[PDB]
Design a protein around this ligand. Structure first.
Ligand SMILES: Nc1ncnc2c1ncn2[C@@H]1O[C@H](COP(=O)(O)OP(=O)(O)OP(=O)(O)O)[C@@H](O)[C@H]1O
Ligand SMILES: Nc1ncnc2c1ncn2[C@@H]1O[C@H](COP(=O)(O)OP(=O)(O)OP(=O)(O)O)[C@@H](O)[C@H]1O
Ligand SMILES: [Mg+2]
Ligand SMILES: [Zn+2]
Lengths: 976, 322, 337
């Protein structure tokens, strides 16, 4: 039954031994030996192998049948007598996207130093090498057997053992090997490819793809590709007041989509979902801990919403009714989680605040409508594309002709139709009778059509008819809770604010969605995958806190001293310890007076007022906020008029003393920063990359030294035909995306003192101080552009970014919308460019869309500016001349201005050089629909020569220089 | 009768997010039909669901020739290429096709009534489209006004000197021709004028029979949303009720394909009860419905009203062929 | 709403720096500029904030004489409200409210109903540019006449209506129509701040523009003879006019000096831009019938509520912008009778 299905999935996972590339001759028996008593049957092995060949690496499984006077081989045993094989060379690995070729260093060091490149069957001087190879292979097999035996012994249920193996078998085996051989040995060994003749993906990625395909086709189930989108996202994210609402919205969205993902995974299997790569995901680890499979290791922080709002899975459905049942199950799971949260809120913050009032009875009949309003808020769209079973019976030529004719019957436009016809021809250009097309040959086409369908089918909405009444004050679109009558709503919400003053305010009247999001942080410790992970909610409350994260001139951040004020983290430095202690005593005495006064009014819970020593608003460190008692009370979140304390004036001595102490601290800690940076990034044309257009020709993804030895026809085909991704290649791409988005961005964000909020796949959303915003942006862009960091894959693609520097007092929704507009502008203007914008508290707006390398030189000139090496007046003159300047006297005018406004000749020359180099990369927005110029700027090429050929180069250069000065002005304001 | 409404100054139409003291930044949205309907109601009340019906509202530009601009359809790619949904019987699914790739970006802008008389056939010229910047711009006023924190940002609609807003009203219900009335959020006003029905309407009205018979003979019909509609029956849903097309005489529908943007969320102030009106969701204007109808259409007008609140100006839809 | 309207006029006695802009190109604080056209403008929101405050302070001093009869606000609220009108008096004197009559005219305070009037944006009408002959010139653009053509039809409209339609002139980027005091003698050309312009012969366009100004701002022109103005209009092309408003305004460098050292402080240097003096602005004021809340017998209809506004503001002198203490903002107003 289901246990048999799980055992079959386990067998399909291990049909290829992890050390298959070491010796291809006896790989099947090694796999059967590593599977132990769970070894596959005969026909089940045959169907598993059929699923494997019909799965991805079809650019290898239709290429490993190279019959050029022999069967081409590429292994490590190199005893493959040339009478029938004629091998090529040592195994390599190629990046699935950029085709970057990496050899295997440490694996060869442990291999015997053979005196010849090739060995025959029974030649002399071979016995010792064969004995050494047998010894090392036996050691590897013993290690694998020990690991798998431990895994089998620990877990009794087939499903638990299957999921545990899929999640940690690679990690445990790598740990054992690095304990035995070496760390680099295990790192290289665990990254061996499956099909060595085209090492474009890892062995384990191929194993996961094989398991997914086999599960999709098992028991007569027709494989189907399913894509799910929960929308809208940006509008739901933007509806925030403090940073906590934004974090709660992001985490809630990620939790909902991961609830759907977990339902799918527990139904079919963890590997059935291609994107996101669940392995290594902190949410997946928490889910595993929930299922009592593996205890959470606390290595990866759960406070980050590390799950995208869409997932793509490969599942097998018996019929359409099964797919409809799956969709209804996903929707009901998500709605059940939402209703659980709504009930928790309604019975812990509403009933607990109106335990006896008649207002509870008035809104008691409105529980159903608000529950249904919250449930029907999001749109859950599930789109499924049945994978066609192409008739491959008959001759190889006839089968390929039938497949191509089926492709031609779809009526697709000539561009991608020609692309897929070329792919099919290149597949059919191999010389082998047994070569046959597979159903998953057009997996890329199915994915593209599925994405189009999802983008179309997700535009349908069905939402209820809410009654009249005043709307929520935060979202603004939904009727507020108990908002039927203004007096009733005000009474209810005042009672709730009195009951919960740490979260709400004196004038907040939320709806179901907004209230659930606001109270989301206090509930999640009692939700499914939690209560056993620990510290999910982050210790950051307001957007001003991340602004204070900027480090001062004494190697100490305002946030750190604020945390010292509450006593959380003591300050090690003693040169300012006395002043800090004085300020802490002053603020503690003032808040003690405030809480003692508030306790007299008997309007707030004693428990909440007791903790005001620790959870007082950090905005009191701003000297502006301490102009009187009413503003001080409002800063802490209390309405003086509502409490009637607008006339109290006996605390003026305390406020004045605190202001004096704050000025004393400012004397050498500097004024507390009031500006922070919002940075949201996206993947550049990821749909095009997955569509195959941005992928390179098949020559790179194949073994480097096998193109020549192969037949000429398919040689030229692979020379000029672009590869199309497939389940294992897609899984490897998603694995690289997971590696980046999980192991890299959090680390550089923490090192950059910023607070990462959402890092799901390609996208990233962080809030950082104005100090390290640009540095971390460039670091993350270079990390994403990387292809092979150490021994782990990386996306090897580009990001457009939108960075906004805005005042902490600015409303969160408008700042987020402006940052999204910046990102959209960056994408609109030759992607792989960062769009930097500054929004001052007054309301003035700056703009600049430049390349990612333009920041460094702009940072250099800004550093020269702040260090008083060059007068700031040079900026004003250059802006004045930017309107009337041309490329011919660019350098001369810049040199004159530099030598005039610098300190010496060397500084002027350096300024000229950095200005000349940096200003080349700046995106421009001409009146005409011109993207070619931005494309030329985006790389660094003959664009300068092309500018001479270009007919409006003067406008381009003028916009370039004006934008460079604008961005350097932004940088100078940020540092200063 | 058209109702030209030239704004003397910029206009701001309040988005549903509140803005009194806290959300100082107040953005703007395109004028909803309810706001202009209320303005016209005030105008007729001063001159002498309202008893009179407002067909809808469109932008216009007056540069020598007076032309009404209709919101850019969601059926037009950014390369001025139409998108047609063709179904794949092999895979059992229907996708939207632009004959240049399965992916496309809708063209934001406008479409003149000459465009409408040609776009309904299935082709679009180059001069038939106008970009957004040629009509209005997003002018954001800043720092308008114990008032250290009252400084609030506001974004308005800065119409071009030759561009305004025209409101379509059915024949009859005559009232004052020239005058001034207040429209929008922060107190502003327009210099409205009453003008005879433009020749573009009669151009499209006279040529209605040709497109109607083409639709009837080809068995295919496309419905273009000039103004947003509330198509829900009990609640608010984007799914097109088959009975709704039964009014025009559709015996049966084979398949319905619709492409549209995010829904518009809006409400109003009930002056009678001094309480905000119930929140509503409407399909955004510019969306198009592709249907495969069985039978024939007997509508004598090239337009029909779909959904609720059609008297205000909601649900202005055009019958076209694909 | 807004049954009728009245036309206001402004004339910068001293340079005006009102508001700011979201552009922030070079100057730290530019002036409020229209988006599509780029002309300098005074937003009706900020213009109302100085119109209402000036009207309010008159009430506290009782200089709002209505129909040649002085206004006494203390008794008027008691006469028309009674009961809590004594408390209304206390609230107004507590600075938590505003005088009664102003709130009928300019709307209630922060703590009902709406103001009977609306303040439109102040669009530019004349701009001063340094010239060679005729030291300074009042430059316009043909579309600026077009903007004035439509707006002026709301109040005047009938002789001016016929002459309003006559305002239709096409100008090239170098030709101009100028008064006699600006044309260089002999060489029929005009120089306006480094730009050489060729005078286009005409006898109606300049006369028509000064015709409507006299009929809408009196025979006197803001303390100057009207005939002395007719010789200094220089209508230029739109691109020329647009360029002038961007670059012919006064950009004033400013810095703060510390007495401890006598030098300037680091980072305390910035540039602010001011609208030039002698800039004839004009703003349309829309007036409607006030909300019926037992108003006094003198402010029933719209015709009575516009006469008070026009009389109390004609030949006034109020300050706009945020540089009052340094003599920036004083403008002479001439309501259109
Ligand atoms: N948990 C999350 N937190 C923050 N941002 C997220 C999260 N999940 C997704 N996003 C991002 O929010 C955006 C919303 O994407 P969405 O699916 O709504 O479509 P879209 O491309 O924005 O446009 P459309 O609404 O027309 O479909 C995307 O950029 C997505 O990457
Ligand atoms: N490996 C992947 N597998 C499946 N879906 C992915 C993968 N990586 C990203 N995606 C999703 O594909 C979608 C891509 O659509 P999107 O609108 O973001 O355009 P794009 O191709 O990323 O580029 P652009 O924004 O520049 O047009 C996103 O929702 C993204 O989350
Ligand atoms: Mg992307
Ligand atoms: Zn809400």
């Amino acid at each position: 039954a289901d246990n048999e299905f799980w055992l079959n999935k386990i067998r399909a996972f291990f049909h290829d031994p992890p050390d298959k590339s070491f010796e291809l001759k006896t790989h099947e028996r090694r796999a059967s030996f590593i599977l132990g008593e769970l070894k596959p049957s005969k026909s089940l092995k045959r169907i598993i192998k059929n699923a494997d060949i019909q799965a991805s690496s079809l650019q290898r499984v239709d290429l490993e049948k190279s019959i050029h006077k022999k069967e081409l081989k590429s292994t490590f045993d190199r005893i493959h007598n040339t009478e029938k094989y004629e091998y090529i060379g040592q195994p390599i690995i190629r990046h699935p996207v950029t085709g970057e070729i990496k050899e295997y260093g440490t694996i060869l060091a442990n291999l015997p130093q053979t005196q010849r490149e090739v060995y025959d069957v029974d030649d002399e001087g071979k016995e010792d090498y064969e004995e050494q190879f047998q010894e090392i292979l036996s050691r590897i097999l013993k290690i694998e057997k020990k690991v798998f035996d431990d895994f089998k012994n620990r877990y009794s249920d087939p499903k638990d053992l299957y999921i545990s193996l899929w999640a940690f078998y690679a990690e445990k085996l790598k740990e054992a090997l690095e304990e035995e051989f070496s760390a680099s040995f295990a790192e290289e060994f665990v990254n061996l490819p499956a099909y060595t003749l085209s090492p474009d993906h890892t062995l384990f990625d191929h194993a996961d793809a094989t398991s997914a395909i086999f599960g999709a086709e098992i028991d007569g189930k027709k494989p189907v590709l399913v894509l799910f989108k929960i929308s809208p996202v940006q509008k739901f994210i933007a509806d925030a007041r403090k940073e906590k609402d934004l974090w709660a919205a992001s985490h809630m969205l990620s939790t909902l989509t991961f609830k759907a993902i977990s339902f799918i995974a527990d139904k079919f299997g963890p590997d059935v979902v291609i994107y996101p790569h669940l392995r290594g995901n902190p949410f997946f680890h928490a889910w595993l801990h929930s299922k009592k499979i593996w205890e959470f290791s606390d290595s990866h922080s759960l406070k980050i919403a590390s799950v995208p709002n869409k997932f793509l899975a490969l599942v097998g459905v018996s019929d359409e009714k099964e797919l409809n049942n799956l969709r209804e199950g996903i929707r009901n799971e998500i709605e059940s989680f939402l209703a659980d949260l709504f009930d928790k809120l309604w019975n812990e913050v509403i009933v607990g605040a109106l335990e006896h009032s008649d207002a509870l009875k008035h809104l008691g009949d409105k529980k159903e409508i608000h529950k249904e309003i919250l449930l029907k808020r999001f749109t859950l769209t599930l789109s499924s594309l049945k994978i066609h079973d192409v008739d491959v019976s008959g001759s190889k030529e006839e089968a390929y002709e039938k497949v191509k004719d089926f492709v031609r019957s779809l009526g697709l436009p000539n561009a991608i139709e020609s692309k897929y016809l070329q792919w099919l021809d290149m597949l059919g250009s191999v010389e082998a009778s047994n070569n046959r097309p597979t159903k998953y040959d057009l997996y890329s086409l199915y994915y593209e059509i599925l994405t189009v369908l999802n983008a179309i089918e997700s535009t349908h909405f069905d939402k209820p008819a809410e009654p009249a009444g005043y709307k929520c004050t935060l979202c603004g679109e939904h009727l507020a809770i108990g908002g039927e009558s203004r007096e009733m709503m005000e009474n209810v919400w005042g009672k709730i604010h009195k009951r919960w003053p740490s979260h709400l305010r004196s004038n907040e009247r939320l709806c179901a969605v907004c209230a659930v999001k606001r109270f989301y942080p206090k509930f999640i410790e009692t939700l499914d995958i939690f209560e056993g992970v620990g510290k999910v909610v982050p210790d950051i409350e307001s957007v001003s806190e991340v602004a204070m994260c900027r480090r001062t001139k004494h190697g100490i951040t305002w946030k750190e001293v604020y945390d010292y004020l509450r006593g959380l983290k003591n300050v090690d430095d003693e040169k300012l310890l006395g002043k800090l202690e004085n300020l802490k005593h002053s603020v503690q005495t003032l808040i003690n007076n405030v809480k003692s006064e508030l306790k007299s009014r008997k309007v707030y819970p004693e428990e909440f007022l007791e903790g005001l020593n620790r959870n007082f608003s950090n905005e009191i460190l701003y000297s502006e906020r301490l102009r009187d008692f009413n503003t001080l009370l409002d800063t802490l979140g209390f309405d003086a008029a509502k409490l009637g304390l607008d006339d109290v004036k006996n605390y003026e001595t305390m406020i004045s003393e605190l202001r004096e102490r704050l000025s004393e601290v400012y004397k050498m800690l500097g004024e507390p920063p009031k500006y922070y940076a919002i940075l949201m990034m996206d993947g550049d044309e990821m749909g095009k990359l997955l569509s195959g257009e941005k992928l390179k020709t098949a020559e790179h993804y194949l073994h480097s030294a096998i193109l020549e030895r192969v037949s000429d026809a398919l040689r030229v085909k692979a020379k000029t035909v672009r590869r199309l991704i497939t389940p294992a290649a897609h899984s490897s791409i998603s694995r690289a995306l997971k590696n980046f988005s999980v192991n890299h961005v959090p680390d550089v964000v923490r090192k950059g003192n910023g607070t990462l909020i959402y890092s799901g796949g390609d996208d990233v959303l962080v809030l950082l101080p104005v100090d390290t915003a640009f540095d971390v942006a460039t670091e993350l862009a270079m990390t994403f552009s990387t292809s092979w960091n150490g021994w782990e894959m990386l996306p090897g693609n580009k990001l457009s970014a939108g960075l906004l520097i805005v005042h902490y007092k600015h409303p969160l929704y408008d700042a987020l919308e402006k940052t999204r507009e910046l990102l959209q502008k960056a994408k609109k203007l030759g992607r792989n460019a960062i769009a930097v914008g500054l929004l001052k508290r007054s309301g003035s707006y700056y703009e600049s869309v430049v390349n990612f390398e333009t920041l460094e030189d702009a940072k250099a000139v800004a550093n020269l500016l702040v260090k008083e090496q060059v007068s700031p007046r040079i900026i004003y003159e250059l802006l004045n001349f930017a309107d009337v300047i041309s490329k011919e006297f660019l350098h001369q005018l810049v040199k004159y201005e530099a030598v005039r406004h610098s300190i010496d000749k060397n500084l002027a020359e350096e300024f000229q050089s950095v200005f000349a180099r940096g200003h080349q990369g700046v995106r421009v927005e001409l009146e005409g629909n011109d993207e070619e110029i931005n494309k030329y700027i985006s790389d660094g090429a003959n664009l300068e020569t092309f500018l001479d050929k270009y007919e409006k180069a003067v406008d381009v250069i003028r916009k370039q220089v004006r934008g460079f000065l604008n961005l350097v002005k932004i940088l100078y304001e940020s540092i200063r | 009768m058209i109702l030209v409404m030239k704004p003397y100054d910029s206009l701001l139409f309040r988005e549903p997010r509140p803005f009194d003291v806290n959300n100082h930044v107040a953005r703007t949205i395109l004028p909803l039909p309810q706001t202009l309907a209320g303005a016209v109601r005030s105008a007729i009340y001063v001159k002498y669901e309202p008893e009179f019906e407002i067909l809808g509202h469109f932008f216009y530009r007056y540069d020598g020739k007076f032309e009404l601009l209709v919101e850019s359809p969601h059926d037009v790619t950014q390369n001025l290429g139409l998108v047609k949904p063709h179904r794949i019987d092999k895979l059992g699914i229907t996708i939207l096709m632009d004959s240049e790739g399965i992916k496309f970006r809708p063209f934001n802008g406008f479409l003149k009534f000459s465009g409408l008389i040609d776009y309904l056939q299935g082709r679009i010229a180059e001069d038939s489209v106008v970009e957004r910047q040629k009509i209005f711009k997003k002018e954001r006023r800043v720092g308008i006004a114990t008032k250290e924190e009252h400084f609030y940002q506001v974004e308005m609609l800065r119409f071009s000197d030759d561009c305004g807003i025209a409101v379509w009203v059915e024949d009859g219900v005559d009232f004052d021709d020239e005058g001034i009335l207040g429209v929008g959020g922060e107190r502003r006003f327009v210099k409205f004028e009453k003008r005879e029905e433009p020749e573009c309407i009669t151009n499209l009205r006279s040529k209605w029979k040709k497109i109607r018979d083409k639709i009837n003979e080809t068995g295919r019909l496309k419905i273009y949303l000039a103004t947003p509609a509330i198509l829900g029956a009990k609640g608010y849903s984007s799914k097109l009720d088959y009975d709704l097309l039964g009014d025009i005489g559709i015996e049966r529908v084979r398949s319905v394909n619709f492409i549209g943007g995010k829904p518009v969320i809006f409400s109003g102030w009930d002056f009678v009860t001094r309480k905000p009106k119930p929140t509503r969701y409407a399909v955004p204007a510019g969306s198009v419905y592709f249907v495969e109808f069985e039978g024939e259409v007997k509508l004598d007008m090239p337009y029909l009203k779909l959904g609720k609140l059609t008297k205000l100006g909601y649900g202005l839809c055009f019958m076209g062929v694909w | 709403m807004f049954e009728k309207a009245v036309v206001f006029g402004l004339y910068s006695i001293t340079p005006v720096h009102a508001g700011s802009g979201a552009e922030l190109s070079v100057i730290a604080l530019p002036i409020q500029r229209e988006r599509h056209t780029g002309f300098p403008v005074i937003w009706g929101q900020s213009l109302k904030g100085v119109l209402r405050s000036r009207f309010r302070q008159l009430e506290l001093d009782e200089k709002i004489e209505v129909e040649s009869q002085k206004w006494k606000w203390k008794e008027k609220t008691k006469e028309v409200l009674k009961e809590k009108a004594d408390e209304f008096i206390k609230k107004v004197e507590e600075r938590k409210r505003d005088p009664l009559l102003t709130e009928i005219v300019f709307g209630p305070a922060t703590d009902e109903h709406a103001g009977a009037v609306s303040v439109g944006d102040a669009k530019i009408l004349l701009f001063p540019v340094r010239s060679a002959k005729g030291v300074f010139a009042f430059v316009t653009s043909p579309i600026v006449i077009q903007r004035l053509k439509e707006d002026f039809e709301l109040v005047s409209e009938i002789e001016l209506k016929q002459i309003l339609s006559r305002f239709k002139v096409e100008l090239s980027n170098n030709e101009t129509i100028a008064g006699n005091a600006l044309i260089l003698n002999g060489e029929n050309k005009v120089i306006l701040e480094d730009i050489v312009l060729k005078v286009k012969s005409d006898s109606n366009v300049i006369e028509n523009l000064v015709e409507v100004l006299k009929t809408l701002f009196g025979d006197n022109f803001f303390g100057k003879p009207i005939e002395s103005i007719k010789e200094r209009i220089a209508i230029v092309s739109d691109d020329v006019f647009k360029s002038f408003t961007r670059f012919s305004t006064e950009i004033v460098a400013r810095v703060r000096i510390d007495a401890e050292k006598g030098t300037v402080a680091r980072g305390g240097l910035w540039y602010e831009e001011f609208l030039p003096s002698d800039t004839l602005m004009y703003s349309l004021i829309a007036v409607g019938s006030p909300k019926k809340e037992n108003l006094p017998k003198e402010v029933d209809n719209t015709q009575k509520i516009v006469n008070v506004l026009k009389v109390t503001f004609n030949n006034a002198f109020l300050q706009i912008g945020g540089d009052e203490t340094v003599g920036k903002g004083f403008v002479k107003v001439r309501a259109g009778v």
